[PDB]
Design a protein around this nucleic acid. Structure first.
Length: 33
RNA sequence: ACUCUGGUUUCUCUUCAGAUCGCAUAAAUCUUUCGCACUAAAGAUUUCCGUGGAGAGGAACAACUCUGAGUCCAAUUUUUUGAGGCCUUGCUUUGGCAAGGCUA
Protein backbone atom coordinates (compact mmCIF):
# COMPACT_ATOMS: atom_id res chain seq x y z
CA UNK A 1 0.00 0.00 0.00
CA UNK A 2 0.96 3.68 -0.10
CA UNK A 3 1.99 3.73 3.56
CA UNK A 4 3.68 0.33 3.20
CA UNK A 5 5.62 1.46 0.12
CA UNK A 6 6.75 4.66 1.85
CA UNK A 7 7.77 2.59 4.87
CA UNK A 8 9.86 0.11 2.90
CA UNK A 9 11.48 2.93 0.93
CA UNK A 10 12.41 4.59 4.23
CA UNK A 11 13.75 1.33 5.66
CA UNK A 12 15.79 0.58 2.53
CA UNK A 13 17.21 4.11 2.79
CA UNK A 14 18.13 3.38 6.41
CA UNK A 15 19.82 0.10 5.48
CA UNK A 16 21.88 1.63 2.66
CA UNK A 17 22.78 4.59 4.89
CA UNK A 18 24.07 2.11 7.47
CA UNK A 19 25.98 0.14 4.82
CA UNK A 20 27.52 3.47 3.72
CA UNK A 21 29.97 3.17 6.64
CA UNK A 22 32.35 0.95 4.64
CA UNK A 23 30.50 0.92 1.32
CA UNK A 24 33.39 2.18 -0.82
CA UNK A 25 36.07 -0.08 0.66
CA UNK A 26 33.79 -3.13 0.90
CA UNK A 27 32.65 -2.75 -2.71
CA UNK A 28 36.24 -2.22 -3.88
CA UNK A 29 37.42 -5.37 -2.10
CA UNK A 30 34.45 -7.35 -3.41
CA UNK A 31 35.11 -6.18 -6.98
CA UNK A 32 38.80 -7.03 -6.66
CA UNK A 33 38.02 -10.39 -5.04
C1' A B 1 51.62 49.31 33.81
C1' C B 2 46.87 50.79 28.21
C1' U B 3 44.02 48.30 23.75
C1' C B 4 42.24 43.68 19.60
C1' U B 5 41.61 38.19 18.63
C1' G B 6 40.68 33.43 20.25
C1' G B 7 35.78 30.92 24.25
C1' U B 8 32.99 27.04 26.56
C1' U B 9 28.74 23.86 26.16
C1' U B 10 25.07 21.28 23.15
C1' C B 11 22.52 19.13 18.49
C1' U B 12 23.21 17.74 13.41
C1' C B 13 25.97 16.90 8.80
C1' U B 14 30.66 15.79 5.64
C1' U B 15 35.48 13.68 5.10
C1' C B 16 40.14 11.19 6.66
C1' A B 17 42.04 7.91 10.10
C1' G B 18 46.92 0.57 10.47
C1' A B 19 46.77 5.56 15.97
C1' U B 20 46.39 0.32 22.30
C1' C B 21 41.88 4.49 16.18
C1' G B 22 39.29 0.50 21.66
C1' C B 23 44.88 0.46 28.42
C1' A B 24 38.52 -3.28 25.61
C1' U B 25 37.66 -7.25 22.46
C1' A B 26 32.48 -10.11 19.36
C1' A B 27 30.33 -12.76 14.95
C1' A B 28 30.17 -14.51 9.84
C1' U B 29 32.58 -16.08 5.17
C1' C B 30 36.79 -18.03 2.26
C1' U B 31 41.60 -20.42 2.04
C1' U B 32 45.57 -23.52 4.32
C1' U B 33 47.22 -26.72 7.99
C1' C B 34 46.97 -30.97 10.38
C1' G B 35 43.43 -33.71 13.28
C1' C B 36 39.35 -37.71 12.65
C1' A B 37 37.23 -28.60 14.40
C1' C B 38 33.01 -25.26 20.37
C1' U B 39 36.20 -28.19 23.09
C1' A B 40 42.26 -25.88 16.90
C1' A B 41 45.94 -22.92 14.82
C1' A B 42 47.45 -19.64 10.57
C1' G B 43 46.18 -15.98 6.52
C1' A B 44 42.52 -12.88 4.17
C1' U B 45 37.70 -10.46 3.62
C1' U B 46 33.18 -8.74 5.67
C1' U B 47 29.56 -7.16 9.40
C1' C B 48 28.67 -5.41 14.05
C1' C B 49 29.42 -2.83 19.22
C1' G B 50 31.91 2.97 19.24
C1' U B 51 35.84 6.21 18.66
C1' G B 52 39.53 10.24 17.33
C1' G B 53 41.19 14.50 13.69
C1' A B 54 39.54 18.22 10.47
C1' G B 55 35.69 20.92 8.16
C1' A B 56 30.43 22.77 7.89
C1' G B 57 25.71 24.20 9.92
C1' G B 58 22.28 24.95 14.03
C1' A B 59 21.57 27.07 19.46
C1' A B 60 22.90 28.23 25.11
C1' C B 61 25.72 31.64 28.09
C1' A B 62 30.77 33.95 29.19
C1' A B 63 33.02 37.48 27.40
C1' C B 64 39.37 39.30 28.48
C1' U B 65 41.87 34.58 33.90
C1' C B 66 44.58 32.21 30.23
C1' U B 67 47.04 31.82 24.87
C1' G B 68 48.98 35.83 22.29
C1' A B 69 49.52 40.29 19.76
C1' G B 70 49.35 45.66 19.19
C1' U B 71 51.83 48.92 23.36
C1' C B 72 65.83 53.98 40.19
C1' C B 73 73.15 54.75 36.82
C1' A B 74 78.41 62.06 37.46
C1' A B 75 84.08 60.36 41.32
C1' U B 76 88.74 54.11 37.72
C1' U B 77 85.08 49.13 33.93
C1' U B 78 82.29 51.87 29.21
C1' U B 79 77.27 57.31 28.84
C1' U B 80 78.81 63.15 32.51
C1' U B 81 86.21 63.54 30.07
C1' G B 82 92.65 64.56 30.26
C1' A B 83 90.41 67.43 27.20
C1' G B 84 93.34 71.18 24.40
C1' G B 85 97.83 74.29 22.85
C1' C B 86 103.70 74.35 20.38
C1' C B 87 107.58 72.37 16.61
C1' U B 88 109.41 69.38 11.59
C1' U B 89 108.83 66.85 7.06
C1' G B 90 105.62 64.92 2.05
C1' C B 91 101.58 66.98 -0.27
C1' U B 92 99.07 71.71 0.06
C1' U B 93 92.13 70.31 -2.00
C1' U B 94 96.91 77.14 0.93
C1' G B 95 91.32 74.80 4.54
C1' G B 96 94.98 71.90 6.35
C1' C B 97 95.72 66.30 6.20
C1' A B 98 99.57 62.07 7.73
C1' A B 99 103.64 60.58 11.16
C1' G B 100 106.91 61.89 14.90
C1' G B 101 108.82 65.21 18.74
C1' C B 102 106.62 67.97 22.61
C1' U B 103 103.78 71.47 26.81
C1' A B 104 99.97 70.89 29.77
Amino acid sequence: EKDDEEADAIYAALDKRMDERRKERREQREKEE
